[model samples]
Target: NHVIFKKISRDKSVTIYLGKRDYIDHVERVEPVDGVVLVDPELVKGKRVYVSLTCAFRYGSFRRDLYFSQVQVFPPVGASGATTRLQESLIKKLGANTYPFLLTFPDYLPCSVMLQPAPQDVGKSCGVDFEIKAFATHSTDVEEDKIPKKSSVRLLIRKVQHAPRDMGPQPRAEASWQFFMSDKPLRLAVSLSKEIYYHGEPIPVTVAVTNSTEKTVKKIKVLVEQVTNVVLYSSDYYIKTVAAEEAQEKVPPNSSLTKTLTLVPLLANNRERRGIALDGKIKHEDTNLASSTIIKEGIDKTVMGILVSYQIKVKLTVSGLLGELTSSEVATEVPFRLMHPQPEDDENFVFEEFARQNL
Candidate 1:
């Protein structure tokens, strides 16, 4: 197993060896971001070399980068970990010309996620991005990589979640409404096959309706609601109905109706919509709607800057007793998981030769 290495300097002065670019964040723990930096002595001559882990949040003009960890290379110091755990062994071998470093982030920050910005909203849209930077500079006091410095080697990395194998019971919701002076209530029951669904899968919804009252049901509408919560500001909420369907199948008074509805929610259809929650965007990979928000036990979910979840909403329109003119609307919703499939397939593989040209 050869180590996957990446180099970005014009003269190849800074070379880094990191096993995986994508880090998995299990609810219990996350892998450490660790790696080895091979610095050319001549290129870094008389100047100190330092590597840093930066977490950047860029939303339009509001941009900020946190240089949480910065460690020296010549002397070999500072910290983050996965590949990090294996670095000690590699460090023993590359001791002649390389510096090994490790970095770890607090659990509170979020998994890499972005809001699908508009086409016109170009240049640093709303998203949480992370990076590893290696620079050979004279300034001991390091600032955000401003003014476009090439002496530094920058690598883009992602923090993502792990899909749970434990699928709970079938997700179901029930709602019943009764008029003040009426005898019976219009009851609605909604259920899904299971609670967990991967991206690109069709969601089959089973809906049942019983009209024990005098009202007539005219139409049934099904919707996929995506809720993206922005926790940075004064706590705002956004509900984007990504998919919907309408059926003319009606239920008469004192009648019973059972039907099945399917809705597939995909990012392709919502590409043009602004503020849609999406997974981290790799340079050349396709992203889906952000996975369901998850957290460790006893942790406040609001700390996650941008949170996302999905819901299935079913609505029934009823016609009044006198005629079809006066109508009442009944609605109910059930929640489910829309996440990346576990043990992701390897189609996202990066070719060593192809990476050379791009950097």
Candidate 2:
């Protein structure tokens, strides 16, 4: 009952629908049809029961070589509370008295669709017929070259009587910002904070995040929005990397996720802006699911939880500060590290003294 279905270009799609209909329609009508229709179980064999489908459709203009195109799935039918129409309407209303169910998309290339069917739809009708519309574009239409490869939408099927109790979907923690160098284990670093200096002085900024929960956050991103009180002061304008020198064990339950961000002796320029706020939301090249949902599905195995959150790290810099200052020494540091539940206070004090002495 567990199987991974594959793509069946135009003709195979027609055949499968007819198999369910118990009657054939224009089976050989089209040469290179638009898209494909495939089910998790390509062949029902003799099983006379329900089947859930996870289908996909992606139809848009294809490149001459089908390389990079604006390829993505259409949204689920009822996702945004839109009124019922053709494709959405059919999916919303999948059954009458006589059949099983199959799910599909709007047709083009392949898009993503998730399906969970009811047990009542089974045994009465032969099976569900999945249909879609798309186009075929090949410079040359050889039989082997005409067929498009099939993609999938992940689907899980279970007998109605044995389905797990509905506890509701798992929750995803919203992205947040915290200071790695502040009193609170996790505190926000806003641009307007009082850490600005005149020309020749260094600006000290600090930040970190804490994923104290037991979950392992594989990657995270941080954005530093910078501002200054006077027009003459500015950030170092260098890339900052946390946890760059070492790695830590998996962040434990009741533990912390921390990193230190910094700027050395802040420069002197007009201090028109004096605040820095880190962008709190994480960015994803592709957001296929909630952060929590993706993690549970092993999506995080290849992804990191953090990014240099772009929106939050804005800087206001001023020119012509070097003419006024005789000394080049200014003080600034943003040390990020964890305050393990152990006796870190004394060690921290020594660390601070060391930094002060050196700076």
Candidate 3:
């Protein structure tokens, strides 16, 4: 096989074929978008065709303050010379019937991310997404603002974040609370086996509960919580639980116990829940939970549309006076990351082999 590709348009007139749809942006660099376009030369005898790329972020399904802008490509279209291995192979097989195209991205562009929409939210919801449009038109002449559908093909693509080369310090948290008239404090310490987690992986939660006071530990609750904040408007914050585990075992007064539990964060249970962030990709067969946001150690995350993060929350229930239902919970959270670690696949390569056509 020369190379695998995705056909975006069915118009035997114009079709955009790309090796992939999801492109990841490494902390240091972002990959350029590249693809091939099959056009019917007879349909357009003496006209020029151009490829365009744009990005937009929308707040609500009905709310539309979104805008589209494109960076001027040097060549505007691919020259005969193939700048990439894939293009070279496509050039050999497709011959004169195909024309290759390249699209480059600015150094700092917002990655594709989405806030899980509410069940009632209709149509398209909040997301930072991208698109590529291939159309037959004129260059020197001013073209209409809207791309005509007569001879145009458009595809939705995603620019995603990759895990850092290294990991942060071990995820650990500790908290101690002293009860009234108690000789000592009820201390709780929690930790995870690894600081980085992937989809379908179980998160190891290590918790040590020391009840040095008269309070008895009634129950223990653990949850893998997803934190999402839409950076567009209002800085709206949403926190939802992805996975949960309950410990039926209890620690009596003046007792110290370690409850080792494995918390597997799965989408099976959370699929029906609302407002969970997900990777801004179109899919129905296999879906991904929104990846944790890693903005190259920078404090300003406003450019990242919707920020996603995960952590383990350990809540310990302590019986209050009269052993009443009026119980108190001592909780601590250990922060960690959930993303595709050292994964595979990359898309989008710019083509600018010749300087003759930089208009």
Q: Among these predicted structures, which one has the highest lDDT?
A: 1
Evaluated against the true structure, the overall lDDT of model 2 is: 0.21
Checking candidate 3 for backbone clashes, the offending pairs are: 32-348, 32-349, 33-348, 34-349
Query: lDDT of all the models against the reference?
Result: 0.71, 0.21, 0.69
User: What is the descending TM-score order?
Assistant: 3, 1, 2
Per-residue lDDT over 1-359 for candidate 1, one digit per residue giving the tens place of the 0 to 100 score: 45455666666777776656777775556667777787887776756667788776666556655336777765444342314446765655555677777777776667777775445533235677778888776544466433226667788777777666466679999999875457798899999988988777899988999999887888899999988776654345668888888866999999999999999898777545475777655233445677788765676665566778899999988877334433456799999877766653311223142142220
Q: What is the TM-score of each candidate against the true structure?
A: 0.76, 0.19, 0.83
Q: Give the per-residue lDDT of model 3 (tens digit) for 9-62.
A: 344566666766677675566777876776676765555567788777677642
Better of 2 and 3 by lDDT: 3
lDDT of 2 by residue, 1-359 (tens): 11112223333321111111111111111111111122323332221222223222111221111111221112112333322232233323322111222232221211111111124322111111122322122224445433232222212111000111122332112233222322322222323123212212222233333443323333333332222111011111213221111223234434454443333221122121112111110121111110011112333221211111111231111112224421231112222211001111101100011010110
Better of 1 and 2 by TM-score: 1
> Which run of 10 residues does model 3 get worst, by summed lDDT?
350-359
Which of candidates 2 and 3 is the stronger one according to TM-score?
3
After superposition, the stretches of candidate 2 with alpha carbons farther than 4 Å from their true spots are 1-8, 15-308, 319-359
